[PDB]
Structure formats: C-alpha cells, structure tokens
Design a protein around this nucleic acid. Structure first.
Lengths: 201, 91, 70, 50, 113, 51
RNA sequence: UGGAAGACCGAAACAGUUCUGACGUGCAAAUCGAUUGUCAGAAUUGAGUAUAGGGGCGAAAGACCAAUCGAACCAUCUAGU
RNA sequence: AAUGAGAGCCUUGGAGGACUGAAGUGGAGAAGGGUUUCGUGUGAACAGUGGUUGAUCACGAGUUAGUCGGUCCUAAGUUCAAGGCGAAAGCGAAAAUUUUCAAGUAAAACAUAAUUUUGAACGAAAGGGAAUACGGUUCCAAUUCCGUAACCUGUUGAGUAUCCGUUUGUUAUUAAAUAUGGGCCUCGUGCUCAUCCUGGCAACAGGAACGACCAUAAAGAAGCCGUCGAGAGAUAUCGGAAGAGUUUUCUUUUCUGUUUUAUAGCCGUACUACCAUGGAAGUCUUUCGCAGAGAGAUAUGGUAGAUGGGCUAGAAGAGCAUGACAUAUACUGUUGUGUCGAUAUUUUCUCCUCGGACCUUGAAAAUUUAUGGUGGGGACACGCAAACUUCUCAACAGGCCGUACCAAUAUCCGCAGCUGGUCUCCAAGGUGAAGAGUCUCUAGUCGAUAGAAUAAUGUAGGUAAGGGAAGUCGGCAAAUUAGAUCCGUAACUUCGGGAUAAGGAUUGGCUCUGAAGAUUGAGAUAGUCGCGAUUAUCAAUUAACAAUCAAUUCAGAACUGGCACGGACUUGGGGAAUCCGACU
RNA sequence: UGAUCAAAGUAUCACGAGU
RNA sequence: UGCUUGGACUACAUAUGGUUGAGGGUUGUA
C-alpha cells in the first residue's frame, strides 16, 4: 500500500555498540550495498542525507523535514521531489519548491535525502481491470469503489432522490456548511474544465 | 508464426477494455519483464521483481528503479543535475 | 528395539551392565536372535550361523534372567 | 462439544441425576403431593437449550 | 476397494498442520497417520542459498539434536554463504588496506608542507 | 534429445553438429524417431564426400 | 512448443430465469420439479473478530441488522389519548 | 423361519427384488447435541400406521493419554490500572500520560557499575506448536486399557583429546606411543615447552573436545494457477503357496489371498546448490516450459540437503493373513505357506526443482539454533583429569481438563424422528473428456402406513398422422439441436473476435495393416583348458541394425447388419434487425 | 555490502601481603 | 538438592506509624 519501495539501511549506533537499522525511502539509483552517508559534512551523492544548507540550489531532494528532527515528512511517495530554490540568509532558512508547485520556506538545518523516490511513474499504467482496482484497495484500507450518492435515496445522501436525475442543488458546498453537508465540490473557486497552462508561476 | 501482427502481449486482455488502452499496455508490459543491463554486473540479467525494484539474477545486486522501467526519464536528468551542482560547490 | 548390534563383542558388553535385568533368546528356523532388554533401547544380536548361536547362549552372565522362548 | 469443557460436564452430570423416576415408596407419605418426578428432562423433549 | 481411512486427530480440516500419509498398518488395517510439515533448509541469508551441513528441522528440534549438526566449523557457519564469505573477507581487507594507503599519503603530505 | 545425448558419449558426431541437431529437435524437422538418424547420416556423409 | 484471461461450455459449488408449474390448512412462515445464470475470480465459505438504534452496513433495493426495519427487539413512562 | 397377546415394515436369520451408486443414505470429526452410546427388562403413552422393538419407557454400565486437542502463544481484536473526562456508572474510550510506571546481571571501586520507557493479561479446540507406535482387548472405550516396542522435557549417575618429551618391556628393532618439542650434561626419570579435538586444497567431514557476556542471521514464516521430477496407497495385469464360485459346454478362468509399524543404524536419486581440474567461439550445455556460462560452461572428478526409496535391527517359522490338523467344540495348542514381475494411470495425496500472473507481490508472536567478540577457568605429563557437557547409555518424575455416539429426510436448529438449512477429511471397477451422468462392488439402506382397485380430474414422465404457431400477451411450455473428428464458414469488428458462425460429411461390430516408445545384444578374429568354461581387440553396424520388453495412442483398408452406428447416458436450435446497459 | 561492548595506552600514587 | 502433595500468603486506592531513599527545591558544617 505504498507504491514506493523502502530501503532497510543499517548503521552503527554511536551510543551503544549495536547495529540499528532504519527504513529510509529508496531513491532511484539506490542499489543495495551503496554506502549512504547521513551528515552535515556529506558529499552530494544519491541517497545521502544532508541538511539543506549544504546542497547548492537546483539540487533535488526527497524525505525533507519541515522542522529539523521531525524525521522526514515530505516527498515520501513515488517520483515526488522538492527542489532547493535558494536561501534566505537571515534566520538560516532554505527555501524549497514543494511537489504541489507551492513554495515554502524551511530551516536550513532540515535534513533531506538527495533523490527522486523509486517506482515513479506508478501512475502510467491505466489499469484495465477493476479487479486490480479492488486489489489495490484491499491492501490499503476499505476505500470502497465509490457508489454515486445520486443512485441512492435522500435518507442515504442529499444528492439521491429522483424520479428523474439529479443532485438537485449545487454539489458545490461551503467550507462552513458543517458535516455531513460536505457532499461534493467543497468550496470550489472555479468548477468546469481547467483550461490551460497549469504550472504555478 | 508472428501470430498476431498488432496485439502482441495485449492479446491476454482480448476484446475487453478498448483498443486505445490496450496500445498503452503494449509498451509498458514490454519494458517490464525485460532484461536490463546491470551497471554493477555489466550483464543483462536484470528483471522486474515488484513495482519499483529490479533484481539482478547474478551478483544479486538489487537496484531501485521506476515502476515499469529500470530508468525513468525524470531520473536520468535528476542524477546529472545534482552531479553537475556538486562540481561547482567543491571547486 | 531400535539399535542393531551386528558385532558379538559389543552385545556381550551390554550383558554386564547396571541395567539389563531381562534377556529373551529365540531359536528360530528363520533367524536366531538374542535380545537384551535395557528399557528404552533393547538391543539385539542376530547370529546367523546357528552353530555359533548354540555356543553364544552361555557366555550370557548367569545373574541375568533369561526368557527361554523355545 | 463432543469433547465437553469441564464446567459443562459437571452441570450436565447433575442434570442426568435429575432425569430419574421418583422412588415409589416416597409417594405413600402423609400429605405427599409427589406423584412422580415430573422435571424429567428427556433430551429431545426438553433440551437444555440456550 | 480396499481399506478406507480414518482421522486419528480431532483436527478434521486439511489445514497446514494436518497432512496425512497413507500407511499399511501391520494388521493390514490401512489407517492414516498424521505427518508434520517437511522442514525447510536453513538459509545462507545474505544470499538465501540453502546451508550445506546444517540440518533442516522444525526449529524446536535443534535442542533435541547434537550441537555439531547445526554447524559448519569455520567462521560464519550459518550466517553467511560460504562463497559470499570469500567475498566478505576480501571486501573488509581492501577497505582497511587502501585506507592505510590514504592515511600514509596524508601523513607524508603534512610533514612535507 | 536423448538420442543425441547417448551419441555424445560414444563419440560419433562432433559437439558442434549435436548442437544444431538438438536445436532442430525442438522445431519440428526431425518428425519421428526415424527422421532424426537419416538426417545425421546424410550430414555425416556429405562431410565425408567434401573431406 | 507454451499456457494468458475479473475469457467461454459446464460439474462440485453459489444463485433463483421462466413455467407466472407442483405445493400453496404443504414436508416448508419460501419448500419441490423441470428449465436455467455463473463456476479460477470484484469466486465460494467456516471459525475467531469489529461496527449497535434516530445508530450501523449497504456493488444503494429504503435493502438488511436472529422468520422483525420508511428506524430492531425488550421493559418502563403506560390502563398514554 | 423364530416369537409373542397381536408381527408386511417395526424383531430377526436364511432367501429374494432393488436403492444410495464411494463428489454416498458410506467410513470420520469440528461447530452443535447432552446421556442421545450400550446391555437388560419391554407396557401404556411416543414412532401423524402397527410396534413383542427403538434415539421410547423402566433398570444398570461405559468416555482411563507426558506424546491428540484444550493448556501455551500470539492475530484480528479485547479486559483495564492514566494524566483525565463524566451526573456517576462508566468512558458506543485504546486513553495510554504514570519519580526509575521500564526488562536486568554467576557484579565489584567514587551515580555501585553496562544497557533498557504503556504497565499488565485474554484472544484461533482449523494459525504457530515439546514428544507414540503396532497388535490384542469393552456390551458400550482406546495414537488412551493391556501387552510390547519407542520418543520428549526436567533432573540424576557413568563414559566419551589426554597415557606422550618418555619408557616400565625389549641389547636394539619395536611397541605402549591420540601428536611433542629444543638444548645441557659421560648420562639422566636432571633443566624444560604445550595440551579449550582432528582431518580435508575446497566444496566440507564427525560422537564428545570452554555459554559467562554481546551484537548478527536463519528457522517459526505462509497466496493462486500451470508443468516437470520422485514417492506412498489405491488401480491395471502375469506367474507361482492357497481357498472359494462357474463347470450342459468352454475357461491354469473369475473373485478373494500374498501384509509390515513408530523408532534407530546403514544406503542414499531424480533435482538442485557448491567445489577442484580446466578454459569454451565454430555459441555450448539444456528444460515440457529458456535459463546459465570468462560471475568459468560443457566435460572430467568430487561435495552437500535426507529430498524420495532401499536393506537390516523392530519381526519370537512375531504380530497379522490364508488353508488344514487336534478337541462335538468353544477356549487353546499345532502344521505349513505369506512369494516373483510389469506399467502410468492417477477416478489421490505428499514432496523436490521451476515458472505464469499482478498499480494483488501473498501473517505475526511464542519458540529454537547459528556465528563473530570480550572474560575467566582448565593451564602439572609419569597425566590425574574434567567438560549448563544444546554427547552415548541407563535411573526417576511428568500435574491439570476432555475423550461414548450422533454430526443429520432419527441424536443439530426450525413447536416435530419436518423433502428445509448446517464446515470439512477419507477415495473402488467399467463406460467416458469428466470427482459428469449411468451401472456395478464394498459399506449402509429398504423406514418414508399399507393392500385392492389402478375412475374422472391431477401431478410427475412420454407419444401422436396430416398440416406446422394458424395458438398466445408473448414460441410460454414442449420439441428440434447437442459429443467427437473432418470439411466449410458471413455481416460487423475495438482485429482480439463474431465462431461451435452459417452450411455439410461421418461415428457400431469384427478383421487386418501402418505409425508412434524403452533396453541391451550381435558381428568378425586370436590365445588357454575340457559345443562348454576362462582371457584379449575394434570402430563401422544404426531408423525399428537386429533382438527383446513395454504400454496404449493416432491414422488407413476390408468384411459385416434391415440405417442399425454420439444408438443408454452426456448434450448449443439457427440466422436477419432493432431497444438498453460496455463487459464478468 | 564488512565489523565496533568491556579502555588499552600514557602519566602520577598505592608500590601492601607471602617466600 | 531432585520429584511430589497439603496448608498459609501475593489485588487496588489511601491514612497513619516504620525504615530505606531522592532532588543543581533549599539550608548549614567542613
């Protein structure tokens, strides 16, 4: 239920004389047996993890911490990557572009693995059978093949109902409309075909 | 016999699931199951174990890769880019 | 009676043991076998010769009880 | 069941004792209401059930 | 026909710990006995290529067995893969050897500054 | 293939020839038992004439 | 040669298409016959186990939740009016 | 036939028609039942009928385990001690915070000194899993009683490198000497070294030959389908110890009978993996299926799992099977014989080596072991030794709870001995593609209240000239069609299908013939001893070389019958359009 | 693609006991 | 010691007494 494979990477524990193995998120070009070096004083090599001050801008990173020591919140799933866009010298921040095209500013102490997370493009295969859609879901959780609430009855959904055939009100519903009126297009700024040049400025 | 000119591998899916979808399948199911050159053994003995993981039958060096392809198009560019920035920072 | 003793000399060593209160002797027209009960291996020597079998009956130590299955 | 837990076996065992027809000399007592053992549990008439 | 077969165990089901091999029992009665899963060879586990000289037993039968049967006498009897043990002596040797070459080069460079 | 196997030890045909023949076991042209040796002997014979 | 597929014919299996058949104070508070769908997988299912009432669950019929569901059952308010 | 008051069933033999038809109405178990099991007595009530008999009614008996389950363990998941919150209870709560709530030492000096953060537990009689077999025995019980033989765990005793440098013995040789070293002194038993195993190049071999302690790995540990390799039991079939049956005729025929345990020792393949030799090109080796080879193939020589089988111990001319003898006989004793092949089918399973499929990639925990490392102790050679020894044998102990039978048209749940529902294990012959249907054998039934009539009307099953859907809401019901092999095969199409399109041919029996496999052997010559025996040589021979053994497949040809030929059974009517949802 | 625990070292004092 | 049987004990919250403790809370002797 994670499309991206993980690496079991085993280290010395510098505190007790024992091997402690931790699960990192496997970047492409991470072959078993490559030495990975996790550090401030690290060479920029795939999959070394380095605090973001150390990597020159336009380096791509995976597994990036939003707060230093929060163990790598971002870019965990297949082919997503953040790019270091540069730095704000005052209050030691490295600014990144998130895989949403959203740009966010993060402290430079934040560690990130130089990488593009393996089995990407997981998306490319269309499917063909809904047996495989079932098989995907039964690993993950009970994400039901989505029964249309129109098809139902008005007790069951506010959208179902009908001699004829409707939602009957804009499926576009407020943020403030309070649960369970959030059947649909929850605060749609614009609805109807996205025309054009998508990518944030 | 070249039994089927058009379908090749997508003849498993036969009549079901519309021709345009079946053309897309043909490329991907060729790239997966295909023996790739292992950079670490120089032998073409690398086959797809599972979705993102390619194990070389000999040397047993198991490499992380793209889901259908050992090297995804993004990756090649990715790896060259980081490498080039590495040179300028050092000297 | 799980353990086989092919060799006469070893069977006799087991005859003078702290254990082996009981022996069974059977003279069979198929195969004449000398059985010694130590409770969990009972050991058996099969003397195939039959001439050797008549003489091997004593060398059995006398303090040991023998069942003379005819 | 078929191999009954010990607690069950004790309860059933007591129940087997109950299934006996009253000694007929007890029926002859002065102000003896007891004609019969009448709580005779015959297994396919009255279970124990539930 | 001949002689049909009865479950000695109350575990009726074809479940993994219930497998039955057919045995001509001496009275000719032909009755089933219950067979334990055939033990899978302990693996050489850095490349899982099945340990020579090391007995396959259901794990809790390796203290009901002699200590010598579980063992190949040299360093990394079970743990490492024989062929892979030549590799792993070599690997360690080289990492250590060429580090000394690096260390000697740095020492000389410091003096000669 | 087993016919070729026996022949390999005796030594009648060269290893080279056996390979070509072994690949022709698979892929029909040696249809019966009877076809295979008639071909072997013709191959041998054609080589004897050239030699 | 090989042996893929929520493939097809059809058993075990599951379901219940049509006869608007038998039965319909029956064997049965849903059975029986004929006929028939499907049967290697979004299959069939047991045990353990979770979800409980204006709630759940629902491949969604307002269906089902112990012969009971357009809001279970049980007691009480309640000999309610 | 027997018995009784009465007997179609139910009481029952013998007999006789059949039934289910080994995917069971059989033989076991779980879930369930709760005395229902079984003997005896046996009447009324009950068995919608009778009923002497029963799952009834009355009276007794019966379910014995260290090794099978429960137990133990964890899973999904749960019970709950918290800081809290609640009206409290409790939390349709997993809250989980709680000095060190934590696990801890065969450890001592200076915060003793290392590490280590929900305590706790329950939760599967199908998951995981300490360890039992065979025969006999009850009315009713057995992997359980008994007999006999094992196996595990805990614990307890003995043994398991060592006898040397040296030497008693021997003038020496030599031997005890597992293997001892070096030097001195005329010499020495004088100085004196070791001894927590050995061998193999390796793959790795073995009976033991430092658990104190750390880390690390493996086992436990896992879907589905397909095929291969190998086995067990069933099956097919021949001979030969036996019996039975048929025997008008024919039949060495038909049926049946020929068995081998846990456990241990040795052997140990197909397969695979690995090692040594060696260096392949002219691609080789090779699978059914294409996997490997300068990451070392082929080949040659080995090694290893004990995978599967063999032979022995087990096994008292055992036990047990078969046919006889003794005693009317029982009980019991005695007499032989228990054996030789062939095959792949699996109307079955197990196990090995593999692969297909996947936006599925196919448990966890207890538990067990392995290896590296750091202590220490044992560190005398006249050699004593020892060794949680995760050794080899023997001693003792192993508690707690369950165990009958039923598992279904009569022991379950439905008011019921109710055509209902209710999970699985077990696998005979023939036909055949089938674990199909059908018949049969074994096992189990023959109870479904019956007899006589066998009306109508039914129900359930069929047939019907000639016409052939005119019927009807509507081809509904019914029929045609069906398997196989061969020939032929459209519209349309997403090129995969449509397709078994349509449309045609043919199918028995008997008698021949061909094709399709396995294995060694011949042939020719020479020497020796009396065609026989012993020894030596060589490649061709080679498509069945020939010979023999195997076991059926696919094809072709006659003869032949009254069109009889998928003869039972199995088993699509077809085509042309339209509406609708893509599809399962 | 591999292993790290037992502070060795160095320095200063203790430099006691037994023979 | 081993093996085996019987009795009595071993919940939690909490007060007090008991003694061990403890914190760069904080005081003092040095």
């Amino acid at each position: 239920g994670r499309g991206a494979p993980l690496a079991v990477v085993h280290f010395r524990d510098p505190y007790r004389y024992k091997i402690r193995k931790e699960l990192f998120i496997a970047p492409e070009g991470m072959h078993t047996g490559q030495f990975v070096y996790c550090g401030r004083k690290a060479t920029l090599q795939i999959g070394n993890v380095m605090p973001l001050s150390q990597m020159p801008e336009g380096t791509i990173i995976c597994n990036l911490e939003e707060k230093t020591g929060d163990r790598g919140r971002l870019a965990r799933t297949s082919g997503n990557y953040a790019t270091v866009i540069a730095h704000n010298q005052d209050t030691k921040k490295t600014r990144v572009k998130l895989p949403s095209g959203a740009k966010k500013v993060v402290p430079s102490a934040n560690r990130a693995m130089v990488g593009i997370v393996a089995g990407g493009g997981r998306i490319d295969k269309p499917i063909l059978k809904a047996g495989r859609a079932y098989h995907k879901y039964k690993v993950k959780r009970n994400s039901w093949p989505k029964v249309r609430g129109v098809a139902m009855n008005p007790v069951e959904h506010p959208h179902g109902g009908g001699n004829h055939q409707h939602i009957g009100k804009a499926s576009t519903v407020k943020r403030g409309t309070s649960a369970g009126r959030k059947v649909g297009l929850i605060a749609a700024r614009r609805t109807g075909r996205i025309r054009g040049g998508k990518g944030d400025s | 016999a070249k039994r089927t000119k058009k379908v090749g591998i997508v003849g498993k899916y036969g009549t079901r699931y519309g021709a345009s979808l079946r053309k897309m399948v043909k490329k991907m199911e060729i790239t997966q199951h295909s023996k790739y050159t292992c950079s670490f053994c120089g032998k073409d003995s690398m086959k797809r174990a599972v979705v993102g993981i390619w194990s070389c039958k000999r040397c047993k060096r198991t490499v992380a890769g793209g889901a259908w392809v050992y090297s995804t198009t993004a990756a090649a560019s990715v790896r060259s880019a980081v490498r080039r920035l590495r040179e300028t920072k050092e000297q | 009676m799980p353990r086989e003793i092919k060799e006469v000399k070893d069977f006799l060593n087991k005859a003078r043991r702290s254990d082996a209160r009981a022996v069974k002797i059977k003279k069979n027209p198929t195969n004449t076998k000398f059985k010694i009960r130590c409770s969990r291996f009972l050991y058996t020597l099969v003397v195939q010769d039959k001439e050797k079998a008549d003489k091997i009956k004593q060398s059995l130590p006398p303090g040991l009880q023998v069942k003379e299955v005819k | 069941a078929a191999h009954k837990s010990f607690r069950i076996k004790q309860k059933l065992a007591k129940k087997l004792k109950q299934n006996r027809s009253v000694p007929q000399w007890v029926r002859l007592r002065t102000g003896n209401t007891i004609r019969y053992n009448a709580k005779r549990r015959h297994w396919r008439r009255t279970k124990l059930k539930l | 026909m001949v002689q049909r077969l009865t479950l000695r165990r109350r575990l009726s089901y074809n479940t993994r710990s219930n497998k039955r091999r057919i045995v001509r029992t001496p009275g000719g009665r032909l009755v089933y006995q219950y067979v334990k899963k055939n033990p899978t060879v302990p693996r050489c586990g850095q490349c899982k290529e099945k340990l020579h000289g090391i007995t396959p037993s259901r794990p809790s039968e390796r203290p009901r067995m002699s200590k010598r049967l579980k063992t190949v006498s040299r360093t990394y009897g079970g743990v490492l893969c024989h062929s892979c043990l030549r590799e792993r002596i070599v690997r360690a040797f080289l990492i250590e050897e060429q580090k000394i070459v690096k260390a000697l080069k740095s020492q000389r460079e410091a003096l000669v500054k | 293939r087993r016919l070729l196997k026996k022949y390999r030890d005796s030594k009648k045909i060269d290893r080279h020839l056996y390979h070509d023949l072994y690949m022709k076991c698979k892929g029909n042209v040696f249809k019966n038992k009877r076809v295979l040796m008639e071909y072997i002997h013709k191959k041998k014979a054609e080589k004897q004439r050239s030699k």
